[PDB]
Amino acid sequence: XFWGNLHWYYEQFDSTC
Amino acid sequence: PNPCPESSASFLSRITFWWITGMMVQGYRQPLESTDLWSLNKEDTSEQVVPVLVKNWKKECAKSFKVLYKTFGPYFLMSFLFKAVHDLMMFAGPEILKLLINFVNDKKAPEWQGYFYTALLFISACLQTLVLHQYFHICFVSGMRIKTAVIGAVYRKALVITNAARKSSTVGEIVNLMSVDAQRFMDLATYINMIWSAPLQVILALYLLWLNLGPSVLAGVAVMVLMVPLNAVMAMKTKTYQVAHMKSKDNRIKLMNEILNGIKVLKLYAWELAFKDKVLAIRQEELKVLKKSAYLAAVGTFTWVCTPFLVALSTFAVYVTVDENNILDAQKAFVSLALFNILRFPLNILPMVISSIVQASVSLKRLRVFLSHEDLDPDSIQRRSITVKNATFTWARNDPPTLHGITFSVPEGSLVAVVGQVGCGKSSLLSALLAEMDKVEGHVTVKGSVAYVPQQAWIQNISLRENILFGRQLQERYYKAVVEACALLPDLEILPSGDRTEIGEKGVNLSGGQKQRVSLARAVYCDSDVYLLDDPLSAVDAHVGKHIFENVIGPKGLLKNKTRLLVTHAISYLPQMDVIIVMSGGKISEMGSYQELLARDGAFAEFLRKLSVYWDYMKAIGLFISFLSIFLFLCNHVASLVSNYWLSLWTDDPIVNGTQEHTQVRLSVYGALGISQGITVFGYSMAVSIGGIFASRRLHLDLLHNVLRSPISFFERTPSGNLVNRFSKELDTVDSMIPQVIKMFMGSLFNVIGACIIILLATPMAAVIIPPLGLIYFFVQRFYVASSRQLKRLESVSRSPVYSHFNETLLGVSVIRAFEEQERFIRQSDLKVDENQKAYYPSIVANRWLAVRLECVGNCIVLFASLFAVISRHSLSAGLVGLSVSYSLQVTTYLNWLVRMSSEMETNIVAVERLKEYSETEKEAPWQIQDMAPPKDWPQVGRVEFRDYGLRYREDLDLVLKHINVTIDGGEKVGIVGRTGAGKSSLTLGLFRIKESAEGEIIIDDINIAKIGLHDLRFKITIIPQDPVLFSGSLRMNLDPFSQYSDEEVWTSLELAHLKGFVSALPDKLNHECAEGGENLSVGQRQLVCLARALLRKTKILVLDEATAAVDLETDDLIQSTIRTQFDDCTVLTIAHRLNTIMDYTRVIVLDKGEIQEWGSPSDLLQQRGLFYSMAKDSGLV
């Protein structure tokens, strides 16, 4: 749910994506 | 009983995660609950995972903790092998693609070689998806296995830790250590491999790019690299706007909390419209910060879409120009373009990885600090009734010793009494025997089991029966005897549920006396050998203590032949106890029995001395903004597909003399289409973000009007928490979440459609494979979206009891170690952690299940696309095949977003309908008709008449008032008195038309009020409530929120009110900031403020509700004295309880039932011997 990133991350960067 | 199917599933099942398919299809049919949930694997259970860590920590600690994280090392080491294989398989698609484009171009070649490449491409892509999601499974498992282990270790440590070390941290910080720091080590376990993987992925991507084009390819890498710090700077600016928005939000919610609470007074004064404008003034300040956030976000979605173009343009423009002999082929153009999209992922994920590894190193340090604290020495007290020999105790490892030189021995089955002044170490003495304090020198031992009763009673939130039982088998006869003996039956009967209820921690609140009485009983029921009572006597009365002491603690009570050492401030029960021990600043001054110890005259003698909801959101944003955004969106996606199709024509042109003929002409047109694309991306991004602010403004103003037009019945039936949650949660969703989601959803949906259009434009035979794959995608999405939300919900509700339990444990550490029930509370914590993982484990497998199905449909699209090209070689050109396959190769990523943002949409759109919930509800009468408007005739006399009037409280109920017929002349002072639950209160609600007249009529000055507008009535008459609440803000605003009349008028009103002395010569004269329902000002001041409000309007009909109810008898006289002189010619209809006020009037009306029982003069009704005479006698004053 990041800035200028519609990259799909299978990772949980601290969840609450 | 109900095992995990993974362990009893075949090899192929485990590879493709087919064993969860049963739980997915079930989750659609019916809702999934905590019972319909598998048992954990043996190797995931707390009792297997936790003991391996605490063993290695004990071993490692001896030698003197990333060295202790070679516990989960062996399993996690397998991760490296799968991830390494994935990185080399990743650069197979582009390498195979180059051969396939050369094949289609090389006309005179063996045809079969084509089919071989397209087969080899599908096989390569399908081993990639399988190996990837094997790598992710064992990463997400190892992270889950760390969480279980860390929580386990922290909990065990929290019991053995010493008081000195626990005083270092807060109860919050230790609960946050289990909640935040342990949670980060689930996440770290995933992306920690990307530290070595991403640089290796970048290094390869650069090198394959270099061989394909040349040194020219740097120009492309430069752009993508320069986007990373632009993404960082803009991601920082949004965070500062988010905090600025959040601070302004709380001001609006805090004001709404006052409005929702104090609507009852707000309606009576007609202050609905005034406070509507006041909330809107704060709302506009919040919508200006979102408007600044909207412009920024637009640039966020701009850079994302135009990056893959800008990179392509910059690289080809450089390559083509620098030398004329550089020919751009399909095999160069589309392979490099595909490599650039492989190169794009690692650079972007690298700033998030490094960012998170830093934050993990903060959490790693916090754990290392907490784990490596000094535990209590267990063999300080022997545990072979109680004896001490020259014991010295500190609270901290090095500190001035608290207790110094104590040597006392207590016979078996005797009552000992510790006495002295405050801060003599009498509190510390019992903490020393329990081995909480650190020993310096001396010998201490206690014989048999020990039962403890602390000063500050600890009561864990469970069934009050199971609280006193404290994990023991029930014995009904004995349980009855101790509850009776503790004098808990008088308290038990009062409690709503009675025997079994909830605790004040999270439920019905118990008083200080009741908390001690449960805590005392808990120890009594246990029936241990030795008892250590740390001042149980904090009860309501000494009469209560007499019953407890004699029946429980004393020699005639329960604990007759049991050792019971007690410490107390009381001097009453000393002559009953056997031996008394006097202390003096941490030293036993003198020991002896009550009789002999007084005779010596020592220290003891001195001591005694739904598509509908989407359409509702469409009408909210506005149709002009809606249509303009959809038009600009389709303009972008068309301008995109044409530019990629133009690139695929630029490739296909012959080489006349080592030159590509027209290249600058094509390069320009390719550049132009990109600007035409980029402009329209910023268009619909801004259009949608602007639209989101229009809906946000509309739906807030719509909701806020709907609430205030409601009657008070709505605010009684509807819970306050339900309304507050609406303004807080649901608006925030419409403001931030929905506008960002709808552009990500539509963006994804039309990228998938866009990719299919190119495949069909390249190969028309592609049609046949579109319905089969689409039908599969629909069904896998259907089950996931349904089942996944249930599992995430179950996980979020099952994690809250783990933190709730640990917080209770941390408070009652002294008790748990006194009774020695650690083992019980360990299993209690292991059970709760397992119940959280039981929910979390399906949740993570559900993601692996979907990902294998979606990527398999992704690999089917790239298979058929590339295959049909080989079937129709002789028709197509090299450029179209490049473009067709290169697009199909990106489909897999969009399908993930399309399924996610489908699920995110379906949850967020629910909030839109719930903001329009109170749109069609029952609304009160029109605020002003302003057709039959009242003139200035009402104050001329002030006649009031009820004509057979009657009201109900509820819509369907027995009548509260009935047959109410009486006439009141202008200037008459009328009294209304009765018994409790008569309905005299309801007559005030009827006069102000809160509830509309159930039957009959009500007249004021020959002009019926039932027909006339509410606000025209509400202003013309004034009211003094029971508890006049003050709204937070100016005192100038609090008196007159409209600020219509002069400031001298406000002064002369406060002068007559006799509140001149208050806010007279304070620097805050008129603009004093009130807050918290008028907490700054005292009880008496509030009555004078609401009197001043009535003295400002100067209306001829006033009403008083509980004017003399719990008053200090200072403002009571000032109220009555002002009423006499100021309202001398004005009508007043007073609702009073006390006779003193009622006695001094011209006329009085008395009703006990719904009907008017008696009426006349106070002096007349005393002589008549009516119900007034009976009321006056029962009151007392005759």
Residue numbers in the entry:
A (entry chain B): 1 to 17
B (entry chain A): 205 to 268, 314 to 633, 643 to 867, 958 to 1530
Provide excerpts from the study.
pmcMultidrug resistance protein 1 (MRP1) is an ATP-binding cassette (ABC) transporter widely expressed in the lung, kidney, placenta, heart, colon, brain, small intestine, and particularly the blood–brain and blood–testis barriers (1–5). By transporting physiological substrates such as leukotriene C4 (LTC4), MRP1 serves to regulate redox homeostasis, steroid metabolism, inflammation, and hormone secretion. MRP1 is a single polypeptide with five structural domains: an N-terminal transmembrane domain (TMD0) plus a lasso motif (L0), and the canonical ABC transporter architecture of two transmembrane domains (TMD1 and TMD2) and two nucleotide-binding domains (NBD1 and NBD2). Structures of bovine MRP1 (bMRP1) have been determined by cryo-EM in four functional states: an apo (inward-facing) form, an LTC4-bound (inward-facing) form, an ATP-bound (outward-facing) form stabilized by an ATP hydrolysis-defective mutation, and a post-hydrolytic (outward-facing) form. Together, these structures have revealed that MRP1 uses the well-described alternating access mechanism, in which ATP-dependent conformational changes expose the substrate-binding site to alternate sides of the membrane and thereby drive substrate translocation from one side to the other.
CPI1 comprises 17 residues: an N-acylated D-tyrosine (AcDY) followed by 15 proteinogenic amino acids (Phe-Trp-Gly-Asn-Leu-His-Trp-Tyr-Tyr-Glu-Gln-Phe-Asp-Ser-Thr) and a cysteine that forms the thioether linkage with AcDY. The overall structure of peptide-inhibited MRP1 exhibits an NBD-separated, inward-facing conformation. CPI1 binds at the interface of the two transmembrane helical bundles, filling almost the entire transmembrane pathway. Residues 1 to 13 of CPI are buried at its interface with MRP1, where they engage in extensive hydrogen bonds and van der Waals interactions. The superposition of the CPI1-bound MRP1 structure with the LTC4-bound structure shows that CPI1 binds to the same site as LTC4 and interacts with many of the same residues. CPI1 interacts with residues in both the P- and H-pockets and, because of its large size, engages additional residues toward the cytoplasmic opening of the transmembrane pathway. The solvent-accessible surface area of MRP1 that is buried by CPI1 is 1,580 Å2, about two times that of the binding surface of LTC4 (796 Å2). Because of its large size, CPI1 sterically obstructs the large conformational changes that are required for reorientation of the translocation pathway to an outward-facing conformation. In this manner, CPI1 traps the transporter in an inward-facing, ATPase incompetent state.
